[PDB]
Structure 1
Amino acid sequence: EKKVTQSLQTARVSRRKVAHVLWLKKLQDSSDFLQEQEEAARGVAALARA
């Protein structure tokens, strides 16, 4: 019977971790400077190679 509880524990922690990912996604979206610096970085990369 102990093995049965093992599966339940994995599901319980899995749901808790899922909610944590949503909070971090908000920050990314809400962040302006992060996106701005990231955007710029990419552009220069291709120009140097071309």
Structure 2
Amino acid sequence: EKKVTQSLQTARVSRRKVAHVLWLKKLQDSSDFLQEQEEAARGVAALARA
């Protein structure tokens, strides 16, 4: 039965990380300076390639 209990503990841990990933997603969206800087870096890369 320990093995069956292990299959339960994996699900319990996985759902705990699912919540944290959502929290980071909110923090990323709130971050606009980071997003604009990354877009500017991508544009600079395209300019260098051209």
TM-score (norm 2): 0.92
For residues 43 and 36 of structure 2, the distance between their equivalents in structure 1, rounded to whole angstroms, comes to 11
* 5+ residue gaps, structure 2: none
* 5+ residue gaps, structure 1: none
Higher relative contact order (CA 8 A, sep 6+): 1
Which segments of structure 1 move beyond 6 Å, counting only runs of 4 or more?
none
Aligned residues: 50
CA root-mean-square deviation: 0.7
For residues 49 and 19 of structure 1, the distance between their equivalents in structure 2, rounded to whole angstroms, comes to 39
